[PDB]
From a paper:
pmcMammalian [name] cytochrome c oxidase (CcO), the terminal oxidase of aerobic respiration, reduces molecular oxygen (O2) to water, coupled to proton pumping, providing charge separation (membrane potential) and proton gradient across the inner [name] membrane for ATP production by FoF1ATP synthase. The O2 reduction site of the enzyme contains two redox-active metal sites, Fea3 and CuB. Electrons for the O2 reduction are transferred from cytochrome c on the positive side (P-side) phase of the inner [name] membrane (inter cristae side) to the O2 reduction site via the two low-potential metal sites, CuA and Fea. Each electron transfer from cytochrome c to the O2 reduction site is coupled with the pumping of one proton equivalent from the N-side to the P-side.
The Fo-Fc map of the IO20 model has two peaks between Fea3 and CuB. Since these distances are too short for two nonbonding oxygen atoms, and too long for covalent bonds, we assigned these peaks to a mixed structure of a peroxide anion with an O-O distance of 1.55 Å and two nonbonding oxygen atoms (designated as OA and OB, existing near the Fea3 and CuB sites, respectively). The two oxygen atoms provide an identical occupancy, 0.40, for both monomers. The other form includes two nonbonding (nonperoxide) oxygen atoms (OA and OB) located 1.82 Å and 2.70 Å apart from Fea3 and CuB, respectively, as illustrated in Figure 8G. The Fea3-OA distance, 1.82 Å, is significantly longer than that of Fea34+ = O2−, 1.70 Å, in the P- and F-forms, suggesting a Fe3+-OH− structure. Thus the other form is assignable to the O-form. The OA-OB distance, 2.71 Å, in the other form suggests an ordinary hydrogen bond, in contrast to the low-barrier (short) hydrogen bond in the P- and F-forms, 2.54 Å (23). The CuB-OB distance of the O-form, 2.70 Å, is unusually long as compared with those of normal Cu2+-OH− coordination compounds, suggesting a very weak negative charge influence of OH− on the CuB. In effect, the water channel is closed in the O-form. The unusually long CuB2+-OH− distance in the O-form of 2.7 Å suggests that CuB2+ has a very high redox potential, possibly because it is under weak influence of the negative charge from the bound OH−.
Numbering used by the authors:
A (entry chain A): 1 to 514
B (entry chain C): 3 to 261
C (entry chain J): 1 to 58
D (entry chain G): 1 to 84
E (entry chain B): 1 to 227
F (entry chain M): 1 to 43
G (entry chain F): 1 to 94
H (entry chain H): 7 to 85
The structure:
Amino acid sequence: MFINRWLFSTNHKDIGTLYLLFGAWAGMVGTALSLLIRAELGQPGTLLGDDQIYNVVVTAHAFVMIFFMVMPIMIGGFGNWLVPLMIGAPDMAFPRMNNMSFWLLPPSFLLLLASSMVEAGAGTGWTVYPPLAGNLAHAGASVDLTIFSLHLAGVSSILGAINFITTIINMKPPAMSQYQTPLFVWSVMITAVLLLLSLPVLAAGITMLLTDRNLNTTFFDPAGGGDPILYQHLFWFFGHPEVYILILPGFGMISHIVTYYSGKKEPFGYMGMVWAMMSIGFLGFIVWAHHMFTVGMDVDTRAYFTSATMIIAIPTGVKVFSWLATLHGGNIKWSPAMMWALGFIFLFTVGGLTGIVLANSSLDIVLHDTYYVVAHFHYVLSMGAVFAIMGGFVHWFPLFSGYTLNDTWAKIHFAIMFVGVNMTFFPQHFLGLSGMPRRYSDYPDAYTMWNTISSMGSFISLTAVMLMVFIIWEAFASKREVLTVDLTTTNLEWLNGCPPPYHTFEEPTYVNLK
Amino acid sequence: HQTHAYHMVNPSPWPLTGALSALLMTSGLTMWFHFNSMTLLMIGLTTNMLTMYQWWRDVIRESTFQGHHTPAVQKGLRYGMILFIISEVLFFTGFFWAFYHSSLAPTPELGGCWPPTGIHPLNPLEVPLLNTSVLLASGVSITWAHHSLMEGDRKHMLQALFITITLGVYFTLLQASEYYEAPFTISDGVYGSTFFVATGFHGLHVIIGSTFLIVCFFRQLKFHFTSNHHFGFEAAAWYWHFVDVVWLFLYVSIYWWGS
Amino acid sequence: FENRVAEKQKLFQEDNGLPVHLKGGATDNILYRVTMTLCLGGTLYSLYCLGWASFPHK
Amino acid sequence: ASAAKGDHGGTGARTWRFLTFGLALPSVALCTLNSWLHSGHRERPAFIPYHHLRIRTKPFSWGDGNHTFFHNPRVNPLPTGYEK
Amino acid sequence: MAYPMQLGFQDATSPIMEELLHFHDHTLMIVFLISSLVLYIISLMLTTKLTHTSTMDAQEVETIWTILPAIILILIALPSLRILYMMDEINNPSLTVKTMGHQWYWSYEYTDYEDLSFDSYMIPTSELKPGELRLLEVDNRVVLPMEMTIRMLVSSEDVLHSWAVPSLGLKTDAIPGRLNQTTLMSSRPGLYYGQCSEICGSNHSFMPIVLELVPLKYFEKWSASML
Amino acid sequence: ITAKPAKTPTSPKEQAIGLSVTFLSFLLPAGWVLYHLDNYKKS
Amino acid sequence: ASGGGVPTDEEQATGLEREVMLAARKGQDPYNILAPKATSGTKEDPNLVPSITNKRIVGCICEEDNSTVIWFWLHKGEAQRCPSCGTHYKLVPH
Amino acid sequence: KIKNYQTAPFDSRFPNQNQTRNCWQNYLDFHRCEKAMTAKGGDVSVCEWYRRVYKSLCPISWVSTWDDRRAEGTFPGKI
Amino acid sequence: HYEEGPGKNIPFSVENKWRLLAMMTLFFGSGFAAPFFIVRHQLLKK
Ligand SMILES: CCCCCCCCCCCCCCCCCC(=O)OCC(COC(=O)CCCCCCCCCCCCCCCCC)OC(=O)CCCCCCCCCCCCCCCCC
Ligand code: HEA
Ligand code: HEA
Ligand SMILES: CCCCCC/C=C\CCCCCCCCCC(=O)O[C@H](COC(=O)CCCCCCCCCCCCCCC)COP(=O)(O)OC[C@@H](O)CO
Ligand SMILES: CCCCCCCCCCO[C@@H]1O[C@H](CO)[C@@H](O[C@H]2O[C@H](CO)[C@@H](O)[C@H](O)[C@H]2O)[C@H](O)[C@H]1O
Ligand SMILES: CCCCCCCCCCO[C@@H]1O[C@H](CO)[C@@H](O[C@H]2O[C@H](CO)[C@@H](O)[C@H](O)[C@H]2O)[C@H](O)[C@H]1O
Ligand SMILES: C[C@H](CCC(=O)O)[C@H]1CC[C@H]2[C@@H]3[C@H](O)C[C@@H]4C[C@H](O)CC[C@]4(C)[C@H]3C[C@H](O)[C@]12C
Ligand SMILES: C[C@H](CCC(=O)O)[C@H]1CC[C@H]2[C@@H]3[C@H](O)C[C@@H]4C[C@H](O)CC[C@]4(C)[C@H]3C[C@H](O)[C@]12C
Ligand SMILES: C[C@H](CCC(=O)O)[C@H]1CC[C@H]2[C@@H]3[C@H](O)C[C@@H]4C[C@H](O)CC[C@]4(C)[C@H]3C[C@H](O)[C@]12C
Ligand SMILES: C[C@H](CCC(=O)O)[C@H]1CC[C@H]2[C@@H]3[C@H](O)C[C@@H]4C[C@H](O)CC[C@]4(C)[C@H]3C[C@H](O)[C@]12C
Ligand code: CUA
Ligand SMILES: [O-][O-]
Ligand SMILES: [Cu+2]
Ligand SMILES: [Mg+2]
Ligand code: NA
Ligand code: NA
Ligand SMILES: [Zn+2]
């Protein structure tokens, strides 16, 4: 029975649980890697070794945090648990294919771990640009293991995308149109469309890199008439949609959390929220070369990419102001999940605004490949995507498990993490403006003070991560079982109790048309 | 007991064996490229084929033999197949982007021209044109097969499907001979790289699509399809039209325009 | 060929509690055991190969 | 375009079989003829060791490492030229 | 170069860098204003026991918070693109200098007249002369004439690098097989530092750039002595 | 939310044990590696 | 040569597919493929909600085009009202 | 006709950041001019402008590689 | 069927909180420890 249930699953909730456990374990790996980065940089000089060991750590840090922590948790974890319940469906469309999306991920992670154990690892950056990642400057198996890791993660997400799109289009109650589905469901659908379109282009590009490394092709090798910059276009054609993939399910969870702890039955401006997520998804495909403003691109192309990138602020601002308008007039419950979501609104906005600074290609000449970029994306990832993950985890843990957290401990955890991430990353704006490059294991002496503060901040976040583990332990150890949950009339996923039975909606909901 | 029309699937080992086959194929390719050994790769390829066989076997058991494919389930599979084909289109789009990037801006190493100095392209009016007529013809014959099936005509369904498959095989054999006869190779710079990787992935999909048509052929021989319910045939025909259209883009772009 | 779908329908709808991947009979169990043995043994072998490749070999 | 043909009323198997045998397979037969007329080897050109061709950044994982997968001795020179 | 506890950009050495500073000041003011407004409104929404939980009509207010951000973006884009095209304008250089990236050092070529070229490596920390800067000095600096328009051409002979001098507002990727152009004009004599700005392997952190800007006559005599 | 009292209450002393064990499980192995870094590098 | 030999659904559909096909022919919807059409929803004319057990979840789209659906369990017994719009629903178990 | 050459002037054929083709074209032009002159008897001095421009713009290693391949018979451009 | 309810819809036991503490310790601790030991591994090669 144990093997049947947990290795042979065809159940959306158990598979969601598998993803949450996998993503939590990956989050520990990614945290350890982040602490090694900041230990190397926490005082001037060399701690670990030269830039190769340092940038194997940096590279693995990014792949682990993105592919094995955020996407499995948001899409595989919250998506599998919540989407079928939020539309009253009895499972996913392809419940057995769903299980393969999960089980491709431990092999993908093993391949990444293998990459770092063989030879001198893949010290390439998570962008894996040639020729540094090619077979002369990264001879041996490490980069190929990284490519294959991405291949498996990519198949996992593409099949998952097919599953979510099909489920959300085809398995709603017959009276429920797409404009009666909750915003988290919308956010997962749009994320899945971005995954479906973008990951095959990544797969093409990394396969070309694999054949340049092993079959003597020369897609990216000028000696054969290839071009390293072609790789960058294919990568970033995926890589910008990817950061919208990383935030969109977060936007969906934030809409639900803000609505719920404002005591509201609905988010402010529902159709504007749908419009904004679709607009962000669409604009996210036509801006990728803002990752390439220093490669030698014509001025008119730089002007286009500057302008197209900045436009995304308009739908994103509608979402931020709609969240604030959802709070407006609420009976505010100062739950730990609400604290995560309020921190999200503010800190995501800061990171979005530094992204708008970077969209200006003239300023980006000086800011590109410096810690100003690192500061931008850690405000939207460590204080955006992750704050939404923590908010959703604390909010829905009693649904998934049937047990409550200790809310005081969870508020303590939020407070520590909030101090930690801001101490880590706010000084990195100063380091970027003043010229500290990315992917450096050591820095000119002038940069010492902010690197020291930044590293101290990273240790505060470590303490928060350790406390999180204790808090989950304490909840399972004490076994306080949920009784009543308010606002079930507008939060269908709670209406089958905590935890819901293995099979829910065996009898579908009744929704009439009028 | 349920009162919706969707399919609760029995707990299944094939997702796990499929995922492990992916691990064995990729670690196997690594072992082959770097440690001079085909062992892991052959195991992975074997378990991959076993996984695909038993998984799609079970889908046939669930539908033809157990009746789980209600109209709602079939509609989901239709969306599933369309989305899968869309993802495959985007995969090929990356190789067409590589082709146009390199050929529209030929670098000095090439002679600054396309085709590169020293490259002698195949004549697009010889076997490439023949291959084009073959896949186009097979798109006509698979449409005849589809109409015969909907009209309840077992013999002409089988005849037309057999002709479609024969043409798929003909294309593959012609392409194999053209690969052997080609005076340029995959190592002949970006010309050979784009040519063989793009037409190579295309050829793999022709083989996949041909195999799928052959599966439909034997299920038809065993009377699995009704005149109204035959999604496996529809999916194989959509995939086959996708293979035909990718070929027409390759022909116009790489063989003709790029010659 | 004659149409024997009806007898397959009877076989795969028999009320015997078997999951669909084993419901054809003893050949299903054999093919399953072969598949899973190759997958698990191959996975162990891939781990051995990682162990080997993680160290220099002169 | 209406192409140049023209036969509906309620589409069907009979029309698509008509197209298969009356247009599609005859076109394949014509192209098969055209191709068999123009086959026959072409003179292999002088070998020139161009550096953008016969790329070898890593030995191939088969054979002696130096032969492409569908190596044809008649028309595919090695980096050092045509084989004996 | 950067100085300890620096918060903002290095002082401008070129007119284009001065334009960037003023444009950054303009944009940062807008960033601060919007960030603070959002923080303030959050606090406003959270500090009253008054409630209103029935359905709220969205149509009117969404005009405001679409139109106002569109106007703000235009107020950023206009000076942004002006600097972009001004950056791009024809200027007619007096001198062309190439730099080739390598693992892990830069080489320079001044071949308008004679065949002058040399390598430029970081000074190891153990060999710094007293008062020299760790990780920033090089053995052979890029001597250049001040107050003159210079064409820099940037490439690489191995992996990607990127040739950067923050106080001149310069960063141009070094790509093998490609020859990227940028222009450089220093308003002042002096020493202007930068660092390799594309990850390039084991010593990425340790292949810096040092420009030495002097009067033309000094540059000419230096050039002749480097042959 | 409302909830039942804990079925198996975790006293302050029990929480102190769970917290201390949790923190040591993260800190001790990494501390051992970092403490011995010189030993690894000088090898 | 227009011949036959392809089974029809009537001949060969089985299991749940066949149940759905046979019920649709009778104009019945035991597997909930169609949206039910609302009554006036008064206490006199409540929406009749079929169930194979003694409670079923109702979602109430109170007004046309509302994006918010109001969800609640409907139990066997006296008609209940949507908590937002008051329209009446009554369970009909079978 | 008369020098005072300082560096290669702006060339409207090559107005963008990537100057690879500017270097390549002036290299080709110089050697094409050279070949034409040396044959019909005349003076390579008429080719001098292209020589100065490609020398200004082209990385030494590119020139060196191209020269080696011309000597080898493997230069892929047309001269 | 399968077990339903709190503590039963998970692949790990929560019947004893101290056994659970050990299991969670091994689980999260092994993830956090792995990069330090991979770094050590790479340092002890070259
Ligand atoms: C926004 C994230 C939350 C805050 C996180 C930590 C909070 C720390 C304060 C931080 C509280 C916000 C104040 C920020 C400006 C402080 C530094 C400055 O004078 O910046 C100057 C510029 C460059 O300017 C110059 O070239 C002139 C230099 C003038 C020197 C004068 C001497 C100053 C004394 C030294 C100051 C030490 C800095 C402290 C170092 C701080 C270490 C942590 O640098 C920069 O652009 C940095 C670019 C940052 C872009 C992100 C903007 C986010 C704004 C959010 C604020 C909302 C409401 C505030 C209220 C926010 C309260 C939450
Ligand atoms: C969650 C992930 C995430 C998100 C959501 C974003 C969102 C944005 N990013 Fe970010 N970005 C990254 C993750 C993300 N980014 C990563 C990982 C990198 C680096 C990759 C690498 O090199 O490794 C990066 C790099 C990156 C660059 C390249 C910089 C360089 O390398 O030199 C740029 C440049 O334009 C950019 C811009 C933006 C913009 C304009 C947005 C916008 O979507 C933000 C829009 C939001 C707002 C503007 C705030 C809310 C709005 C209002 C309150 C309305 C009013 C506001 C105005 C009127 C301005 N990003
Ligand atoms: C989701 C993405 C993500 C996240 C969360 C983080 C988190 C952190 N990152 Fe990361 N980082 C990247 C993505 C991310 N990073 C990327 C893409 C790069 C560029 C790589 C490259 O240059 O190639 C990068 C680069 C980068 C650098 C630059 C290295 C360089 O240029 O040399 C630094 C340095 O300080 C850094 C530090 C940190 C720190 C201290 C954290 C800390 O905030 C981490 C703190 C801990 C957490 C945030 C908790 C994590 C765990 C969970 C959330 C699981 C929760 C469990 C349950 C819910 C059950 N990162
Ligand atoms: C470097 C080399 C790397 C190699 C990596 C290989 C990785 C994976 C190993 C793959 C093993 C595949 C085994 C067969 C999987 C068949 C899946 C399938 O057919 O899934 C179907 C759904 O997907 C659908 O239709 C439509 C979708 C069909 C997808 C078929 C499988 C595709 C796998 C590769 C996808 C790559 C996409 C690439 C685009 C770049 C059915 O879904 P189930 O939930 O099963 O059933 C539901 C029941 O109601 C059926 O009666
Ligand atoms: C899941 C992650 C997996 C990552 C995969 C990385 C690639 C793994 C392939 C490596 O396989 C090893 O290759 C060696 C070299 O071919 C073999 O030794 C062979 O060659 C040795 C060196 O000559 C000799 O000592 C031995 O006789 C002989 O067994 C060894 O047995 C084999 O296992
Ligand atoms: C970034 C994540 C890590 C953050 C910081 C970790 C905080 C460190 C926690 C303590 O770790 C222990 O520290 C001891 C020293 O205090 C080490 O003992 C070492 O030193 C002792 C004292 O000299 C000797 O008695 C021991 O034998 C010798 O192993 C011991 O191995 C190590 O487990
Ligand atoms: C970046 C990409 C080239 C990718 C490649 O080198 O492979 C090119 C191809 C087509 C280009 C676009 C088209 O030329 C149309 C537009 C032309 C404008 O002058 C700039 C924006 C503009 C929208 C271009 C931006 C960018 O240069 C594009 C998208
Ligand atoms: C055996 C079967 C008769 C129909 C039935 O079983 O009732 C017949 C009808 C259609 C026949 C097939 C089709 O006519 C197409 C093919 C024609 C080739 O000449 C022989 C194989 C070929 C594949 C035939 C084999 C076999 O004779 C088939 C399959
Ligand atoms: C069901 C189970 C799979 C367990 C798994 O999923 O972990 C069993 C059933 C038959 C077993 C296989 C073989 O029939 C027997 C092999 C020898 C031993 O008895 C066990 C390993 C052995 C190689 C088995 C692997 C695996 O444990 C199998 C496949
Ligand atoms: C028409 C459509 C859906 C309305 C509905 O059927 O409920 C609504 C939903 C979101 C609306 C958009 C968003 O509110 C954002 C913009 C707001 C501006 O006031 C008008 C244009 C604007 C772009 C709106 C146009 C239009 O009214 C949209 C697109
Ligand atoms: Cu050179 Cu980084
Ligand atoms: O990517 O921003
Ligand atoms: Cu981007
Ligand atoms: Mg860069
Ligand atoms: Na350091
Ligand atoms: Na059909
Ligand atoms: Zn109502």
